Amino acid sequence: AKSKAIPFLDAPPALDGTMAGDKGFDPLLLSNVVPIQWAREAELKHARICMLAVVGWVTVDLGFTVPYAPQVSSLAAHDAAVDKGVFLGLLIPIALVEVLAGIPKCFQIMNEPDASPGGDYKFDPLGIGASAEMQEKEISNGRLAMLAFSGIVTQAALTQGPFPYTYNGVEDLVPPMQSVQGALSIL
Amino acid sequence: SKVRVIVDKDPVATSFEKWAQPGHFSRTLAKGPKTTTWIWNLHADAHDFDSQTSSLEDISRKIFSAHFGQLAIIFLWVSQAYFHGARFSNYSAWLLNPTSIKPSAQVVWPVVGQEILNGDVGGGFSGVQITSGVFQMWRASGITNETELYWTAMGGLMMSALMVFAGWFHYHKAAPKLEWFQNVESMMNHHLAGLLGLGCLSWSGHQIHISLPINKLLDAGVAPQEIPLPHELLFNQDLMAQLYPSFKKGLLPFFTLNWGEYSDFLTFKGGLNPITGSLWLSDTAHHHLALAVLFIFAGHMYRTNWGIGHSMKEILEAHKGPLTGEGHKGLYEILTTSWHAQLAINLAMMGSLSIIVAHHMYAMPPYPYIAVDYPTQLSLFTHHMWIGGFCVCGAAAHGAIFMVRDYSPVQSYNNLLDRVLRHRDAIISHLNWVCIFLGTHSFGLYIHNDTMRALGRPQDMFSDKAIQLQPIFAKWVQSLHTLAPGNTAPNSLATASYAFGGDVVAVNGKIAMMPIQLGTADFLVHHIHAFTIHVTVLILLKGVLFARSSRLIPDKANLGFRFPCDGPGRGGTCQVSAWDHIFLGLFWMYNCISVVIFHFSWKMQSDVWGTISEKGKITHITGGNFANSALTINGWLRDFLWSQASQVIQSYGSALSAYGIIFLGAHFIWAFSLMFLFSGRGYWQELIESVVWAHNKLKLAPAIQPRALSITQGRAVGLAHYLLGGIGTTWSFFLARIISV
Amino acid sequence: AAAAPATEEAEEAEESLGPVGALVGDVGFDPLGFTEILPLAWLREAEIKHCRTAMLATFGFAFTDFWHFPGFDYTTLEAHDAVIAQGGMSQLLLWIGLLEVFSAISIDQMLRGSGREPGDYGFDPLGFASDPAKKADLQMKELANGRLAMFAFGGFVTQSVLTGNTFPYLFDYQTAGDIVAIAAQGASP
Amino acid sequence: PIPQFNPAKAFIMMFSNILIICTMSIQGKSLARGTPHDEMVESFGITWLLAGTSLGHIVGAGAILGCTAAGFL
Amino acid sequence: MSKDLLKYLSTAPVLLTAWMSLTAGMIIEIQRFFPDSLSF
Ligand code: CLA
Ligand code: CLA
Ligand code: CLA
Ligand code: CLA
Ligand code: CLA
Ligand SMILES: CC(=O)O[C@H]1CC(C)(C)C(=C=C/C(C)=C/C=C/C(C)=C/C=C/C=C(C)/C=C/C=C(\C)C(=O)C[C@@]23O[C@]2(C)C[C@@H](O)CC3(C)C)[C@](C)(O)C1
Ligand SMILES: CC1=C(C/C=C(\C)CCC[C@H](C)CCC[C@H](C)CCCC(C)C)C(=O)c2ccccc2C1=O
C-alpha cells in the first residue's frame, strides 16, 4: 500500500480515507506521534490565521485604511500601530476567543473520548453547511494561504516594494513583458 | 507510553473530624492519653508516615502534599521580605546612597520603652538594621521603585495560596498512584531541563533585559527616579542599543551562530566591578546562559516514552569490579522503593551545597555594594555554614533510618552495601586512628605554642618567626589562580576572585576584596577544621554502619531506630542506638561550624576588611593580629572573644541592646541545656512523685498522670537547648560586633 | 453526548456543573472548569453577591456623579479617600462586616447542607415573588441585571479615570464633535 | 535558521548532522553498525531524525564556533 | 463552624495559645495606657 502523494513511500496507516484534505501526504510519519485531531486543530487554526493575514496584508498594501490609522505599507504597519499604541487592543478579542474556545477544546481533544473535530467550532451562523466538498475547499484554500503568506512576507521584506512583491513588479511574473527583442534575435 | 499519569480520584474526604481526634495517625496513640507521654509521642510521630501506614503509595501522597505546604510557607516567607521592603524600609534612601545609609526594614512598636531599638539607620528613618542582604539582591534585579516590591509581595501571597490549594488538591482530590512517583527517569529529565535550565534561561533573559541596563544607568550616576521603567526597556531596541550597541543586529546573530557579536553584554571579564565592588552582571547573565544550555542538554539523558535515553538500572549494574563483587546492583530498587535513602543523599548534597555557597559568596560578592556591607557578608557566611551542618547531620540520620527499616538482605546480597557492612570495623578503626592523629597533631601544636609562650620561649614555637609550617600547596594553588588570566584562562581579563592574589578593590574607602595571605596559623586552623570534620564523620558513619547490629548487641535492628538502651547489662549499653549517634554527632557539627565561623570572622576582620586612605594606606579592623595571635589558645581567648565581646557587652542603652539581651538569654538557655544533658529520668520521676503526693493531698491529681520526659526525649531536649543557646550566643556576638565596627 | 448550549464545541463533560437547569440561567458556560475544584453552591453565592454589589455600585457611582449630601462636597473619584479621612467608610465597613459575618455563618450552614439555596436570604418584604410561578423568572432577571451591572461598573470606573468626565464617561471628541460623520476624516480625533 | 550568506557555515552543520545521524546508536542499532534503514524507520520513526538532528546541531554549533574562534568562517 | 471544628478549637494547645495571646494583649494594652508603674 503506497501513498497517493509519494508513490514510492508506503502509505501512512493513520490516514485512511476520511478527514477532508487527505492526499495521502505524510512523510516523517508525524500522524503516529502527534494525535490526528490535535494536528487538524493546529492546521486549521494556521489556515484561518493565514487567510485573514493574506487578505489584510494585501488590503492594507492596496491602499485601504480605516480613519485615524497610520497610512503606511503593511510592512511598516506593525511598527506604526505599536507606536500609536492601539495594536495591543487587538489582543482582547484574540484572548477571549483563544482562551475560552481553544483551551477547553484542546483539553477535550486530548482527554474527552467523544468530542468535536479540529476545525469544528460549530460556528455556522448563516447556515451555508459543512459539507465534505466545503471542508476540502477550506483546507485547500488554507494550505494555499499558508504558503502564500510565507512568500508574501519573505518577498516584501526583501524588496520593500509594492503589491507584486517582485524586484521589477509584474514584469518579473510575465517575461514576455520584458524586451522580446532578445528572444526574437535567436529566431 | 510507559511514562503516564495515573491518578486516583477523591481518595480522602476533606473533613474537620480527625482534627478533633489527636493521635489518629497511629494505632497506639489513638486510644487516648493515660500519662503525659502520649503528648510527646504525638508530637514525635506526627511526620513519621512510614510507621503510620504500610502502603508506600499513601506515604508518597502524604510526602507530596507536605512538600506543597512547605513551598507555601516559603512563598509567604519571600512575600514578607518583599512587603517589609515595600512598606517598612528605607530602600529608596539606600538606593540614593548605598554606602552611608544602613539597610533597615523592621520597625518596632513603642509600648514598653523598646522604641530605643529604632536606631538611626540614616535617610531620615528609624528601625532595626538588616543583615539579610535583600536590599543588594533587589538592587541587582533593578527594583529601584517601591511599587515593584509591593507587587512582588502580592504575587508571593498569590503563589502561597496556589501551593496551599495544590496541597489540598493532590491529597484529597487527585492523588497520584505509586507508579507515578517511581518514574525517576522522567522526574530527572523534567527537573534537569524544565526546572534548572529553564530557570537559568528565564533569569538570564530578565538579567539581560532589565538588570543590565538599570544597573548600568545606576552605576553611571543616574538617580533611580529618572531611570526608564523595566517595561520601557523591554521593548525598546533603540534604548538598549544606546546602552549596549549590539541590539541593533537583533536576534539574527544568535541564529546565524555569530555569537561573538553579543560580547557587549555577554562577557568573561571576571574580577570585580570597581563601582560596586561586585561581580559584573554581564558575567552573571553569560554564566546563567551557559548553565541553561548545559542543564537543558543534561536533561535529555534518561529514557522516557520514546526509545532514546538511558535507563538508570542499566548504568548502575554495568559498574562493577573485582574488589567490589556485584557493584551497584540493587541500588536502583533501594532508591526507587525508599524515601529515607533519597533523604540521605539529598540532605548531604544540600548541606554541602550550602557550605559551598558560604565559601563562594564571600570571595566573590555577587550583589552590588554587598562587599562593603560587612554585617551582611558575615551573617550570610555563618547562616549558610549552620544550614549546611544541620543538613549534613540529617543525611546521616536518614541513612541510619533507612538501614534500620528499609534494608533487605535478600535484595542487597554481595552488592556495595553488603560489602561495606561486612568490613565496617576496618572503616571505623582507621577513621578512629585518623581522628586521633589529626587531633593530637592539630591541637597539640596549639598547646605546645601555649606552653612555649607561657615559659618565655617564643623561639621554640610553631610560628613564622620560629619553626615554620607553611601551607605550600595552598600557596601554589593561589599562585596558579593568579596567573590564570591569559595563560590558562586566555579570554579572561581578571582573576576569578581576588582572594587568590592580585589587586585590592576599594569602594568609597572601604575594602571590598583584597588578597588573603596564608601563614602557619592558617595551616593550623585548616588542620583543626579537617580534624573536626573527621570526628563528626566518625560519629555519624559509626551510627549508620552499626545501626542494625554490632558485637555488643547482635539484634539492634529489632529494637528500632531510636531506643534509649538495652539495659545496664554487658557492663552498660547506654546510647547504643543510631539516634544517639546522631545526637552525639550534632554536638561535633556544632563545634566544627563554630570553629569555622570563628576562623572566618577573625581572619576577615584582621586581614581583609578595613579602610584605605591616600597613597594606599590599609588599616584593617583589628590591625593584622591574626598572624601572631591565632597560634595559641590564649591568643584566641584574649584577642578574639574577650576583645570582640566589648561591642556586645557595652550595647546597653543603645540601639544594639537587644543583642546584649539575646547574649545573656542564650547563655542562660545553653546552661539550661546541661540540666537535661547531665541528669537522668529516675531522679525526676521520684521528684514528680513527691510533687504528686502534695497534689493528691489537695485533690489536684490530673487524670493524665504526670511523668518525667523519656530518656530519648530528655537527650533531644538537652541537645536542642544546647544548639539554640550556642547559636544564639554566637549570633548576638557576631551581629553586635560587626554592626558597631 | 450532551454538548454545552453556550459553547457546543465542548460538551457538558464539565459534569461538576451538575444536571441541566439545576440553576436558573444554566447554559453550561464553564470553559475554564472552576466547578471541578470548587463547590457549585459557594460559587453561586459569590456570583449572586457580586451581582447585587455591582448593581448598587453602578447606581451609586452614577448618583454620586450627579448629586451628593451637604458636607460631602467631593467628586465620585475622590469620595473614597476623602470619606476615609472623614470616617464614614469605617462605619460602612463595620456595619457591612457585621452583616457579612452573619452571611459567613449562613454560608457555613449552607455548605454543610442545612437547607439553603445560594443567594437566598428570604429578603422579600414587598412580596414580589411570593407566587412560586414568578420565583423562577425574577431570579433570571436578577442575574442578567447583575451581570450587566458588573460590566457596567467596570466600564464606569475605567472610563471615568481614563477620560476624566462625568456620567457619559466619554472623550471630548465623542460629545463635542460628530460620531456619525461620513466626510473624509483627518488623522487625530 | 540559516547563516548570513556563509556557505562554509552551511557545510559544517549539514556534515555534522549527517555524520551524527550515520554514527548514532539507540539500543545497539545504528546505520554505521550495519543495521538497515527501513527497520530503524520502523523501530524509531521521527525520534531517530529528531535526536540525530538535535545532536548534530549541538556538534555543528561547537565546530562552527571553534572554527570561528580560530579563523575560517 | 461545626460540631467538630469547635472540638478542635477546644484542644489544649489552641486554647493555651489563644488565652496566652489574650493575656499578653491585655497586659500590653495596660502598659500602653498606664506605663512605667513602679508603685501602686
Ligand atoms: C491575521 C489577521 C490580521 C492581523 C494580525 C492584522 C493586523 C493589523 N491590521 Mg489588519 N486586516 C485583516 C487581518 C489582520 N490584520 C483583514 C482580514 C482585513 C480585511 C477585512 C484587515 C484590514 C485592515 C485595515 C483596513 C487596517 C488594518 C490595520 C492593521 C494593523 C493595526 C490593527 C490594530 O491596531 O488593531 C486595533 C484593534 C482594535 C481597535 C479593535 C480592538 C477591540 C477593542 C479593544 C474592544 C474589544 C472588544 C470588547 C471586549 C467587547 C466590545 C466592547 C464595546 C463594544 C463596548 C495591524 C498591523 C490598520 C493599519 O494600521 O494599517 C496600516 C488598518 O487601517 N487591517
Ligand atoms: C518541567 C516540569 C517540572 C517542573 C518545573 C517541576 C518543578 C518542581 N517539582 Mg516536579 N515533577 C515533574 C515535572 C516538573 N517539576 C514531573 C514530570 C514529575 C513526575 C515524574 C514530577 C514529580 C515531582 C514530585 C514527586 C515532587 C516534585 C517537586 C517539585 C518542586 C521542587 C521544589 C523546588 O525546587 O522548588 C522550586 C519552586 C519553584 C520553582 C516555584 C514555582 C512553582 C511552580 C509550580 C513551578 C512551575 C511553574 C510553571 C510551570 C512555570 C510558568 C512560567 C510562566 C511564568 C511563563 C518544583 C516546583 C517536589 C515538590 O516540592 O512538590 C511540591 C516533589 O515532591 N515534582
Ligand atoms: C529535609 C529535611 C528533613 C525532613 C523531611 C525530615 C523528616 C523526618 N525526620 Mg529528620 N532530620 C533532619 C531533616 C529532616 N527530617 C535534619 C536536618 C536532622 C538533623 C538535626 C534530622 C534528624 C532527625 C532525627 C534524629 C530523627 C528524625 C526523624 C524524622 C521523621 C519524623 C520527624 C517528626 O515527626 O518530627 C516532628 C517534628 C517536630 C517534633 C518538630 C521539631 C521542632 C524542633 C526540634 C525545634 C525547632 C526550634 C526552632 C528552630 C527555633 C525555636 C526558637 C525558640 C525561641 C522558640 C521524618 C521522616 C525521626 C524519626 O524517627 O525518623 C523516622 C528521628 O528520630 N530526623
Ligand atoms: C575540651 C573537651 C574535649 C576534649 C579534649 C575531647 C577529646 C576527645 N574526644 Mg570528645 N567530647 C567532648 C569534649 C572533648 N573531647 C564533649 C563535650 C562531648 C559530648 C558531645 C564529646 C564527645 C565525643 C565523641 C562522641 C567522640 C569524642 C572523641 C574524642 C577524641 C578525639 C581523638 C583525638 O584526637 O584524641 C587526641 C586527644 C586530644 C585531641 C586531646 C588532648 C590533646 C593533647 C593536648 C595532645 C596530646 C597529649 C598526650 C596524649 C598526653 C601528654 C601529656 C600526658 C603525658 C600528661 C579525644 C580524646 C572521639 C573519639 O574518641 O574517637 C577517636 C569520639 O568518637 N568525643
Ligand atoms: C445604628 C445606628 C447608628 C449610629 C448611632 C451611627 C453613628 C454614627 N455614624 Mg453611622 N451608619 C449606620 C448606623 C449608625 N451610625 C449604618 C447602618 C450605616 C450604613 C451602613 C451608617 C453609615 C454611616 C456613614 C457613611 C457615616 C456615618 C457617620 C456616623 C457618625 C456621625 C457623627 C456625627 O456628627 O453625627 C451626625 C448627626 C446628625 C447628622 C444628626 C442626625 C442623625 C440622627 C439623629 C440619627 C437618628 C438615630 C439613629 C438612626 C440611631 C438609631 C435609632 C434606633 C431607634 C433605630 C456617628 C459615629 C459619619 C461619620 O463617620 O462621620 C464622623 C458618616 O460619614 N454612618
Ligand atoms: C458559514 C456561516 O454560517 O457564516 C460564516 C460567515 C463568514 C464570515 C462568511 C465566514 C467565513 C469565511 C471567511 C471569513 C472566509 C475568508 C477566507 C479568506 C480570507 C480566504 C483567503 C485566501 C487567500 C489566499 C488563498 C491567497 C492566495 C494567494 C496566492 C495563491 C498567491 O500566490 C499570492 C502571490 O503573493 C504570492 C504568494 C507571491 C507574489 O509574488 C505573487 C502573488 C501576488 C500571486 C464564517 C467564519 O464561515 C462564518
Ligand atoms: C528537668 C528534667 C525532666 C523533668 C521535665 C519535665 C517534666 C518537662 C515539663 C514540661 C513542661 C510542663 C512544659 C512547659 C514548661 C513550662 C510550664 C512553661 C515555661 C515557659 C517559659 C518560656 C517561661 C525530665 O523528665 C528529664 C528526663 C530525662 C533527662 C533529663 C530530664 C530533666 O532534666
PDB file of N, CA, C and O in Angstrom, chain B residues 28-56:
ATOM      1  N   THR B  28      -1.335   3.190  68.404  1.00  0.00           N
ATOM      2  CA  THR B  28      -1.199   3.256  69.857  1.00  0.00           C
ATOM      3  C   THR B  28      -1.772   4.550  70.424  1.00  0.00           C
ATOM      4  O   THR B  28      -2.456   4.532  71.453  1.00  0.00           O
ATOM      5  N   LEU B  29      -1.505   5.682  69.770  1.00  0.00           N
ATOM      6  CA  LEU B  29      -1.872   6.975  70.338  1.00  0.00           C
ATOM      7  C   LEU B  29      -3.354   7.293  70.182  1.00  0.00           C
ATOM      8  O   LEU B  29      -3.858   8.182  70.877  1.00  0.00           O
ATOM      9  N   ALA B  30      -4.063   6.589  69.298  1.00  0.00           N
ATOM     10  CA  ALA B  30      -5.463   6.903  69.036  1.00  0.00           C
ATOM     11  C   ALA B  30      -6.400   6.448  70.147  1.00  0.00           C
ATOM     12  O   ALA B  30      -7.579   6.817  70.125  1.00  0.00           O
ATOM     13  N   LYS B  31      -5.914   5.667  71.110  1.00  0.00           N
ATOM     14  CA  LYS B  31      -6.756   5.158  72.185  1.00  0.00           C
ATOM     15  C   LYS B  31      -6.914   6.139  73.340  1.00  0.00           C
ATOM     16  O   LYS B  31      -7.629   5.828  74.299  1.00  0.00           O
ATOM     17  N   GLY B  32      -6.273   7.303  73.279  1.00  0.00           N
ATOM     18  CA  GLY B  32      -6.408   8.300  74.314  1.00  0.00           C
ATOM     19  C   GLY B  32      -5.239   8.306  75.276  1.00  0.00           C
ATOM     20  O   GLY B  32      -4.552   7.297  75.463  1.00  0.00           O
ATOM     21  N   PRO B  33      -4.987   9.452  75.909  1.00  0.00           N
ATOM     22  CA  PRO B  33      -3.856   9.555  76.836  1.00  0.00           C
ATOM     23  C   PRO B  33      -4.159   8.997  78.217  1.00  0.00           C
ATOM     24  O   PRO B  33      -5.229   9.209  78.789  1.00  0.00           O
ATOM     25  N   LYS B  34      -3.190   8.258  78.752  1.00  0.00           N
ATOM     26  CA  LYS B  34      -3.211   7.838  80.145  1.00  0.00           C
ATOM     27  C   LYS B  34      -2.180   8.558  80.995  1.00  0.00           C
ATOM     28  O   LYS B  34      -2.427   8.793  82.178  1.00  0.00           O
ATOM     29  N   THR B  35      -1.038   8.915  80.410  1.00  0.00           N
ATOM     30  CA  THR B  35       0.023   9.639  81.090  1.00  0.00           C
ATOM     31  C   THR B  35       0.454  10.805  80.213  1.00  0.00           C
ATOM     32  O   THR B  35       0.039  10.922  79.058  1.00  0.00           O
ATOM     33  N   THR B  36       1.298  11.682  80.763  1.00  0.00           N
ATOM     34  CA  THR B  36       1.810  12.804  79.980  1.00  0.00           C
ATOM     35  C   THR B  36       3.046  12.407  79.182  1.00  0.00           C
ATOM     36  O   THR B  36       4.063  13.109  79.198  1.00  0.00           O
ATOM     37  N   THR B  37       2.950  11.290  78.472  1.00  0.00           N
ATOM     38  CA  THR B  37       3.915  10.846  77.480  1.00  0.00           C
ATOM     39  C   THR B  37       3.270  10.712  76.110  1.00  0.00           C
ATOM     40  O   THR B  37       3.946  10.862  75.089  1.00  0.00           O
ATOM     41  N   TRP B  38       1.951  10.494  76.082  1.00  0.00           N
ATOM     42  CA  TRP B  38       1.170  10.477  74.849  1.00  0.00           C
ATOM     43  C   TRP B  38       1.262  11.801  74.099  1.00  0.00           C
ATOM     44  O   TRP B  38       1.171  11.833  72.868  1.00  0.00           O
ATOM     45  N   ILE B  39       1.444  12.906  74.826  1.00  0.00           N
ATOM     46  CA  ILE B  39       1.586  14.218  74.197  1.00  0.00           C
ATOM     47  C   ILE B  39       2.895  14.298  73.415  1.00  0.00           C
ATOM     48  O   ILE B  39       2.923  14.679  72.234  1.00  0.00           O
ATOM     49  N   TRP B  40       3.999  13.918  74.061  1.00  0.00           N
ATOM     50  CA  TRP B  40       5.301  13.995  73.411  1.00  0.00           C
ATOM     51  C   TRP B  40       5.432  12.943  72.316  1.00  0.00           C
ATOM     52  O   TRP B  40       6.084  13.182  71.293  1.00  0.00           O
ATOM     53  N   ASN B  41       4.814  11.777  72.512  1.00  0.00           N
ATOM     54  CA  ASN B  41       4.789  10.766  71.460  1.00  0.00           C
ATOM     55  C   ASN B  41       3.930  11.209  70.284  1.00  0.00           C
ATOM     56  O   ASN B  41       4.223  10.856  69.135  1.00  0.00           O
ATOM     57  N   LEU B  42       2.862  11.964  70.552  1.00  0.00           N
ATOM     58  CA  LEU B  42       2.055  12.548  69.486  1.00  0.00           C
ATOM     59  C   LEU B  42       2.870  13.535  68.667  1.00  0.00           C
ATOM     60  O   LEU B  42       2.787  13.561  67.434  1.00  0.00           O
ATOM     61  N   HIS B  43       3.656  14.371  69.344  1.00  0.00           N
ATOM     62  CA  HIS B  43       4.492  15.328  68.628  1.00  0.00           C
ATOM     63  C   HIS B  43       5.642  14.666  67.879  1.00  0.00           C
ATOM     64  O   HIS B  43       5.999  15.127  66.790  1.00  0.00           O
ATOM     65  N   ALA B  44       6.224  13.602  68.428  1.00  0.00           N
ATOM     66  CA  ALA B  44       7.366  12.947  67.805  1.00  0.00           C
ATOM     67  C   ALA B  44       6.993  12.116  66.587  1.00  0.00           C
ATOM     68  O   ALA B  44       7.817  11.960  65.679  1.00  0.00           O
ATOM     69  N   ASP B  45       5.779  11.570  66.548  1.00  0.00           N
ATOM     70  CA  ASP B  45       5.366  10.648  65.499  1.00  0.00           C
ATOM     71  C   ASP B  45       4.462  11.296  64.460  1.00  0.00           C
ATOM     72  O   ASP B  45       3.825  10.580  63.681  1.00  0.00           O
ATOM     73  N   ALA B  46       4.383  12.628  64.436  1.00  0.00           N
ATOM     74  CA  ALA B  46       3.451  13.309  63.539  1.00  0.00           C
ATOM     75  C   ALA B  46       3.864  13.157  62.080  1.00  0.00           C
ATOM     76  O   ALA B  46       3.016  12.972  61.201  1.00  0.00           O
ATOM     77  N   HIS B  47       5.165  13.231  61.803  1.00  0.00           N
ATOM     78  CA  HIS B  47       5.672  13.185  60.438  1.00  0.00           C
ATOM     79  C   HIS B  47       6.297  11.845  60.081  1.00  0.00           C
ATOM     80  O   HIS B  47       6.874  11.708  58.998  1.00  0.00           O
ATOM     81  N   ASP B  48       6.196  10.852  60.960  1.00  0.00           N
ATOM     82  CA  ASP B  48       6.750   9.530  60.691  1.00  0.00           C
ATOM     83  C   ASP B  48       5.680   8.720  59.964  1.00  0.00           C
ATOM     84  O   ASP B  48       5.032   7.839  60.528  1.00  0.00           O
ATOM     85  N   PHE B  49       5.496   9.043  58.678  1.00  0.00           N
ATOM     86  CA  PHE B  49       4.470   8.389  57.871  1.00  0.00           C
ATOM     87  C   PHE B  49       4.770   6.917  57.625  1.00  0.00           C
ATOM     88  O   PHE B  49       3.845   6.151  57.335  1.00  0.00           O
ATOM     89  N   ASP B  50       6.037   6.510  57.725  1.00  0.00           N
ATOM     90  CA  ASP B  50       6.394   5.117  57.487  1.00  0.00           C
ATOM     91  C   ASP B  50       5.887   4.206  58.597  1.00  0.00           C
ATOM     92  O   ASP B  50       5.663   3.013  58.364  1.00  0.00           O
ATOM     93  N   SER B  51       5.703   4.741  59.803  1.00  0.00           N
ATOM     94  CA  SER B  51       5.156   3.974  60.913  1.00  0.00           C
ATOM     95  C   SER B  51       3.642   4.089  61.029  1.00  0.00           C
ATOM     96  O   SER B  51       3.044   3.373  61.840  1.00  0.00           O
ATOM     97  N   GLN B  52       3.011   4.963  60.246  1.00  0.00           N
ATOM     98  CA  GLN B  52       1.562   5.117  60.274  1.00  0.00           C
ATOM     99  C   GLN B  52       0.865   4.190  59.286  1.00  0.00           C
ATOM    100  O   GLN B  52      -0.173   3.606  59.612  1.00  0.00           O
ATOM    101  N   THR B  53       1.417   4.048  58.083  1.00  0.00           N
ATOM    102  CA  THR B  53       0.851   3.191  57.053  1.00  0.00           C
ATOM    103  C   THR B  53       1.941   2.300  56.475  1.00  0.00           C
ATOM    104  O   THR B  53       3.111   2.685  56.408  1.00  0.00           O
ATOM    105  N   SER B  54       1.543   1.099  56.064  1.00  0.00           N
ATOM    106  CA  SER B  54       2.447   0.164  55.411  1.00  0.00           C
ATOM    107  C   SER B  54       2.411   0.273  53.893  1.00  0.00           C
ATOM    108  O   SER B  54       3.127  -0.469  53.213  1.00  0.00           O
ATOM    109  N   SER B  55       1.601   1.177  53.348  1.00  0.00           N
ATOM    110  CA  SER B  55       1.460   1.351  51.909  1.00  0.00           C
ATOM    111  C   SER B  55       2.358   2.493  51.454  1.00  0.00           C
ATOM    112  O   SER B  55       2.230   3.619  51.947  1.00  0.00           O
ATOM    113  N   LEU B  56       3.259   2.200  50.511  1.00  0.00           N
ATOM    114  CA  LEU B  56       4.186   3.212  50.014  1.00  0.00           C
ATOM    115  C   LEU B  56       3.465   4.303  49.229  1.00  0.00           C
ATOM    116  O   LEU B  56       3.938   5.445  49.178  1.00  0.00           O
TER     117      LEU B  56
END
